[PDB]
Amino acid sequence: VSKGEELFTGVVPILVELDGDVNGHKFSVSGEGEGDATYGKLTLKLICTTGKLPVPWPTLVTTLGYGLQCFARYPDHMKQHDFFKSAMPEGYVQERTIFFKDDGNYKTRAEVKFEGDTLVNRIELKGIDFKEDGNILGHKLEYNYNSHNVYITADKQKNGIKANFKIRHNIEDGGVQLADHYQQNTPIGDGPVLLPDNHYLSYQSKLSKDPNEKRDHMVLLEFVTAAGITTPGWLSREQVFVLISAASVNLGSMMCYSILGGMIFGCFALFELLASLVFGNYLVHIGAKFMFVAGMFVSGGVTILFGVLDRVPDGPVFIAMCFLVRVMDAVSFAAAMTASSSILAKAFPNNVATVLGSLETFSGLGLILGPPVGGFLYQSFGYEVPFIVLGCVVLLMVPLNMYILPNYESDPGEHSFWKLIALPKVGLIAFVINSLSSCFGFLDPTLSLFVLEKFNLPAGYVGLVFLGMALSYAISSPLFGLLSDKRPPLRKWLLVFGNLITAGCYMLLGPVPILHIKSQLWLLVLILVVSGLSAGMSIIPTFPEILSCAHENGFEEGLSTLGLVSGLFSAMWSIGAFMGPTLGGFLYEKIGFEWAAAIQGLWALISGLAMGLFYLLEYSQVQLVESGGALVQPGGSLRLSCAASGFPVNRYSMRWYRQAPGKEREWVAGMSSAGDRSSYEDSVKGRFTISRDDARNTVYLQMNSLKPEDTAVYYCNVNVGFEYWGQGTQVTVS
Numbered sequence: 001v002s003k004g005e006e007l008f009t010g011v012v013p014i015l016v017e018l019d020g021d022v023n024g025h026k027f028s029v030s031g032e033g034e035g036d037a038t039y040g041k042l043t044l045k046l047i048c049t050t051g052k053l054p055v056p057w058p059t060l061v062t063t064l065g066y067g068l069q070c071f072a073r074y075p076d077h078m079k080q081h082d083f084f085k086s087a088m089p090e091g092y093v094q095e096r097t098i099f100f101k102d103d104g105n106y107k108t109r110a111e112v113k114f115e116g117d118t119l120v121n122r123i124e125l126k127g128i129d130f131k132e133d134g135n136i137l138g139h140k141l142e143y144n145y146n147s148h149n150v151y152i153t154a155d156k157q158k159n160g161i162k163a164n165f166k167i168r169h170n171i172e173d174g175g176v177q178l179a180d181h182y183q184q185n186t187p188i189g190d191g192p193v194l195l196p197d198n199h200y201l202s203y204q205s206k207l208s209k210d211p212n213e214k215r216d217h218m219v220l221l222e223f224v225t226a227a228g229i230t231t232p233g234w235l236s237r238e239q240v241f242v243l244i245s246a247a248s249v250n251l252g253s254m255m256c257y258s259i260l261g262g263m264i265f266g267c268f269a270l271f272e273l274l275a276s277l278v279f280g281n282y283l284v285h286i287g288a289k290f291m292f293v294a295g296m297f298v299s300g301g302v303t304i305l306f307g308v309l310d311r312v313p314d315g316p317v318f319i320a321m322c323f324l325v326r327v328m329d330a331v332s333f334a335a336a337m338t339a340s341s342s343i344l345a346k347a348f349p350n351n352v353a354t355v356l357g358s359l360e361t362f363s364g365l366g367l368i369l370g371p372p373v374g375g376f377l378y379q380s381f382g383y384e385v386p387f388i389v390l391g392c393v394v395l396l397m398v399p400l401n402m403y404i405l406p407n408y409e410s411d412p413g414e415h416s417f418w419k420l421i422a423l424p425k426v427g428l429i430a431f432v433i434n435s436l437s438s439c440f441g442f443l444d445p446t447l448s449l450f451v452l453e454k455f456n457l458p459a460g461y462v463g464l465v466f467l468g469m470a471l472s473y474a475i476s477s478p479l480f481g482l483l484s485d486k487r488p489p490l491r492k493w494l495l496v497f498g499n500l501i502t503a504g505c506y507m508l509l510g511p512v513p514i515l516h517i518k519s520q521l522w523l524l525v526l527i528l529v530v531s532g533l534s535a536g537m538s539i540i541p542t543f544p545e546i547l548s549c550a551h552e553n554g555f556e557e558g559l560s561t562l563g564l565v566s567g568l569f570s571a572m573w574s575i576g577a578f579m580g581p582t583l584g585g586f587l588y589e590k591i592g593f594e595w596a597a598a599i600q601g602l603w604a605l606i607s608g609l610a611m612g613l614f615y616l617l618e619y620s621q622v623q624l625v626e627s628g629g630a631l632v633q634p635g636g637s638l639r640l641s642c643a644a645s646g647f648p649v650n651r652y653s654m655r656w657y658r659q660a661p662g663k664e665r666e667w668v669a670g671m672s673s674a675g676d677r678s679s680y681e682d683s684v685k686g687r688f689t690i691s692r693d694d695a696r697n698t699v700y701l702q703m704n705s706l707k708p709e710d711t712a713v714y715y716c717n718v719n720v721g722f723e724y725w726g727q728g729t730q731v732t733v734s
């Protein structure tokens with residue numbers, strides 16, 4: 001960790017100038033924009049002042065967009081290898097030599113300095129031996145750009161770094177143009193710079209235009225990450241810190257709710273919805289740590305003051321005290337839930353479902369700890385006593401959470417609440433979770449009445465079967481959390497099937513007089529256990545799906561979006577808990593439990609079918625799938641098929657790539673937009689044939705007159721703004 005790391009904790013306004021010559025034609029370009037090193041984001045708007053560019057803009061993307069490598073996000077084992085922020089309070093120099101294949105050369109000198117607030121980059125360019133009928137001077141490069149890798153090794157002799165990479169530009173005729181880049185980077189101002197190990201950076205890029213501008217300009221978007229040296233594999237300090245804290249909080253709150261769980265019941269959810277929405281909307285202004293500790297302090301205060309109601313005289317003071325205890329319990333649980341969910345969403349970015357499943361398992365393992373020590377404290381000390389013993393142990397666990405938790409700081413976002421809530425998929429998520437919470441709230445009060453009226457057992461076995469259903473939920477939560485984490489497209493399927501199995505469970509809850517099924521005990525207990533498993537298999541994949549839809553819509557990453565999605569999760573669980581018991585009790589007094597369970601299960605079933613119909617109707621995502629790999633004797637003939645998913649083939653160009661073992665990727669052939677022009681390598685010239693078919697949205701490559709040289713893995717390449725690849729097929733010849 002260096003001193004210049006602290007400078008890049010925010011947004012940086014950046015300014016770029018270039019002056020260069022190409023065969024006597026001189027140009028000067030100037031640009032402005034922003035950078036963000038927390039996530040690796042660069043956005044520039046770049047305008048010429050001299051006039052027309054005889055050279056294409058993708059030739060200058062590698063000079064201006066790669067000219068600011070200081071906004072690279074490094075993971076926690078790569079902060080030791082940061083060089084760019086090490087010398088940034090004074091500045092560095094970067095010299096680059098670019099060899100275009102079968103054409104001339106660029107040589108650039110650039111200096112990147114930090115003047116005032118702004119970051120300044122000055123570039124001088126020299127261009128040597130360009131043909132007039134070439135891809136560069138003839139304006140033959142497509143107006144999009146590809147994703148790349150940049151490899152950096154160290155250099156002790158100049159205390160700097162040296163990087164090598166290649167850039168594949170697309171030409172309009174179908175082919176590609178290769179540009180090989182060699183750069184050397186050196187500090188100027190004697191700063192303690194970190195000479196790194198061998199590593200590399202991955203660049204995603206995007207290129208567009210501002211439509212209101214009528215000059216010559218480019219809008220450039222850069223995503224950067226860094227890798228190359230593998231992790232130790234075990235956790236960090238902050239992650240074990242937040243796991244111990246969240247586990248202890250979840251244990252304490254669960255056992256507090258288990259040991260002591262109309263106007264006040266509904267106004268409780270009425271304040272709970274508002275508290276969840278307000279805490280979701282304003283979280284960075286309060287902070288995750290402060291709101292964690294505040295929610296735990298108010299929760300412990302509530303469970304201390306719950307014993308005092310026996311010494312409060314009956315009258316207006318009893319109402320004015322129980323009301324305040326009810327609303328403080330509501331806002332304390334809301335604040336603690338949203339704070340814990342947001343901080344664990346930030347702490348584990350890729351493994352978000354596994355942590356939530358593990359905390360659900362610890363909540364179950366803590367609620368099964370209630371009866372023995374609870375009976376010890378009840379028939380050993382008394383009844384006023386166990387609540388204040390619980391309050392003492394929670395208020396002694398609180399300063400640990402004051403000591404341990406890190407200080408995450410962020411800035412307010414660019415969008416609002418109302419843009420997030422207006423998505424269709426999010427509304428269907430909310431409707432599914434309303435069905436689940438309403439089924440749970442209906443299952444609360446009438447089960448004890450049904451057991452007492454039919455089977456003649458008291459509330460002890462009602463609590464026992466509640467324990468069994470919670471245990472099935474606790475077992476089924478982390479496994480399907482791990483399954484939803486590891487496989488992305490199975491997550492939405494587990495969302496649909498969970499609600500469908502839950503609906504089947506609530507229809508088997510009440511034996512329908514049409515269906516002729518008899519009532520007994522172990523069948524009922526088993527259906528409740530399977531209902532717990534279905535609820536667990538549904539509820540865990542909800543939060544990552546809302547996160548994926550939020551990042552897919554275009555919300556900027558940070559803590560604002562995590563806070564909003566956690567607040568919406570708590571809000572939907574609040575409005576479901578509200579809607580559930582009132583409709584369940586109304587249906588129980590009106591028509592009976594037997595049809596009430598059927599109507600509730602049918603509600604859940606139509607919720608799941610609406611979800612499944614939205615998935616069956618409006619799904620589309622860019623994908624390339626391939627087929628045609630086998631083993632053929634030399635001199636044979638083959639056909640390879642690349643089937644696309646979510647773009648028109650007749651409006652975009654297509655490329656075919658190949659790779660040999662122990663060798664880099666090589667371009668084979670390319671097919672343009674209009675379908676009349678094709679491009680080939682001389683090793684596949686006259687032999688390989690490319691074809692398309694826009695009716696079935698598929699492209700094909702046919703081969704004849706085989707050689708042992710063409711044993712390779714073949715790939716299919718598009719660019720629809722981003723670069724998308726395929727999994728490849730193995731083609732072997734003898």
Ligand SMILES: COc1cc2c(cc1OC)[C@@H]1CC(=O)[C@H](CC(C)C)CN1CC2
Nearest residue numbers: 250253254257261333363440539573577
């Ligand atoms: C009566 O309202 C409440 C109902 C419930 C809970 C808390 C309540 O408030 C005290 C807990 C909360 C979560 O930890 C768990 C449920 C999800 C919201 C993650 C476990 N459940 C049972 C339902």
